Design a protein around this ligand. Sequence first.
Ligand SMILES: OC[C@H]1O[C@H](OC[C@H]2O[C@H](OC[C@H]3O[C@H](O[C@]4(CO)O[C@H](CO)[C@@H](O)[C@@H]4O)[C@H](O)[C@@H](O)[C@@H]3O)[C@H](O)[C@@H](O)[C@H]2O)[C@H](O)[C@@H](O)[C@H]1O
Length: 718
Amino acid sequence: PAVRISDGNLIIKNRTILTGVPDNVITTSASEAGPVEGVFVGAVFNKEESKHIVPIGTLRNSRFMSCFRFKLWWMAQRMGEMGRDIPYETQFLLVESNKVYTVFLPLIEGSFRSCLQGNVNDEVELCLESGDVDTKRSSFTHSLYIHAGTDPFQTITDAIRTVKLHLNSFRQRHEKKLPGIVDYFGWCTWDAFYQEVTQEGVEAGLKSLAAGGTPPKFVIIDDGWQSVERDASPIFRLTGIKENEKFKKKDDPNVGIKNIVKIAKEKHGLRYVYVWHAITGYWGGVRPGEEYGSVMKYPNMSKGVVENDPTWKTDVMTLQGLGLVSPKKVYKFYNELHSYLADAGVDGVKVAVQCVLETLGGGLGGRVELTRQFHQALDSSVAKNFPDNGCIACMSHNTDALYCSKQAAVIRASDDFYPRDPVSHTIHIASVAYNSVFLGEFMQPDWDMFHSVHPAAEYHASARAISGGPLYVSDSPGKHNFELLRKLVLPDGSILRARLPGRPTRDCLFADPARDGVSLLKIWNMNKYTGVLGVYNCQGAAWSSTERKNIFHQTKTDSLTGSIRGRDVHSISEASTDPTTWNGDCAVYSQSRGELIVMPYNVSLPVSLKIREHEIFTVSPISHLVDGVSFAPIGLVNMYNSGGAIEGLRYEAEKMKVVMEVKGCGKFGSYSSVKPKRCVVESNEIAFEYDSSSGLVTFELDKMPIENKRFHLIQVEL
Ligand SMILES: OC[C@H]1O[C@H](OC[C@H]2O[C@H](OC[C@H]3O[C@H](O[C@]4(CO)O[C@H](CO)[C@@H](O)[C@@H]4O)[C@H](O)[C@@H](O)[C@@H]3O)[C@H](O)[C@@H](O)[C@H]2O)[C@H](O)[C@@H](O)[C@H]1O
């Protein structure tokens, strides 16, 4: 059978994972397709309730990684070995058996949402909640799915796919359409002006970035553009769907947000303009009234949320309530808002405050149903009005929204970049990476804005470059480091985006790089013909289970030594042009030191980093043309994700030749065991340098491709 409950134990491929599984916990592997390689898990209770806790069994001596909600809106990571260390509001749990990896996916079932939590006796408890005292139930069959496998990343993907086939309520990341913003540099107004943003400020930011040679091609007009008012520190509520006076042209107040849109696009060459709104309209919802059936609703506290984030009990939203648009009118609300924006030339929305819905289901069939209804309406309106799929999900890390993510393709992966909070930087990097392990199954992770002028700029920028996600700053106008931005952004505003969600390496999945005082975090991604690896020291700070907020904590050393290997890039074989004959040797380029090293298969290279330092490595499979003639493309060596520039690669061993298609401009690098005879770009021989000690070949790609002609055609004759 393979995953099974026997005697009182949960057994996975002949390893006991849980003991003391109680008799009322039921399993099934049946499906309409049919037998499934894991087990759905439920339980039967005596009483109908709107909340149940049930132990699934006892976990001891098994290393785990968990993603848990430290705030309502947002997850972070926790590792451990005992059930007692499993946080409240655990939404994703991965367990290592010492070789076999087991995923636990607590699910939505009917009107109920589940999560996991640990107890003092080391039990892993399943917590099932409808979010509404009127919505009650006494038995469940599919509230948790458990699946095991030998590759931890494949195990997670396979488990998600099985849940999808049972629920049919979401699609996997790879089945969705990415909006076109993810291929361009952008700018977000949020940290530049906060809610004091004006149309002149938007224009000044677009102009200042473009002037330094790194032109953004998308803009997010963040919180502050909307027409909002306090009731007749008081909460603001939405009072109409159009923009406020700061976005009406001063000249003609009848021309609204279309003015800044046309300025952005026609005068400054932007492609996309997005705006922020809350899933409820504004922070205080929408002012009560009959037009969208808005009525006052006050957040209901759930125990697990409040145990981890006690300030939510006295948040302005909790105490002052939200005007909640009616489910009967929610499509009308989004569709009138979004029709107005789209008719003004707006291409998408950043939709924030998403998880509040789970607290507002009391009148209305509970957390799952209300979430599903608002998302169904949001998705219809987005698909109508922003048909490039222009939606970024924000403050949305609840399983109620994840398991109905049928269309939206970009998700903010962590709590906000905080330019003024020194504790936040190392935390942010760990959180984006670990959360991306689970969130990247549903949507492309967005690792958030950052500042190009800031002590942690390079640390943040480097992580964005390897994230696979949208790349955007929130710089105040005129506060730019263009030397840093040139490592991210080409002269036409395009970026070198990697192909996958950036995630921790296999090595790092079970070792906490914020708390263990011993390990570096390694983040891997893939391009088409190289891998990429980012190494970070993020020790010294993390969410505290006793203070219930992010704090600094003590470290034994400042500096830590770890190591890298080619195969740390988990999917590196996929970059090889001949994976069946490849021996696993890679060329490894350090983009900060500018050093090229050949690393044989399995050979480790030491890396030492102090807290808040990082290093980026481009990792390229070596091709052996003939004895003594070996090559690997590196890419745009003065960019962080250098290998993202290589769009085609063919070896012609019979002519001793390499044929490449390369996007961008700047210095191009490659590994060759021999000095090339000639390097040719677009039919003309060009000069080049060769370091015979390292094998590094280097030449300049002078300008971006002429036309249109999207790539430089390069021939390296060995
Ligand atoms: O609004 C635009 C913003 O929306 C998303 O982020 C929202 C943000 O909300 C919560 O933090 C709000 C706020 O808290 C801190 O600010 C103060 C400082 O004491 O605390 C008050 C609110 O409680 C606030 O008035 C104070 O100024 C913080 O320093 C500040 O940055 C925050 O904005 C929530 O805790 C947080 O996790 C976030 O979700 C979106 O993610 C942003 O990109 C942006 O669009």
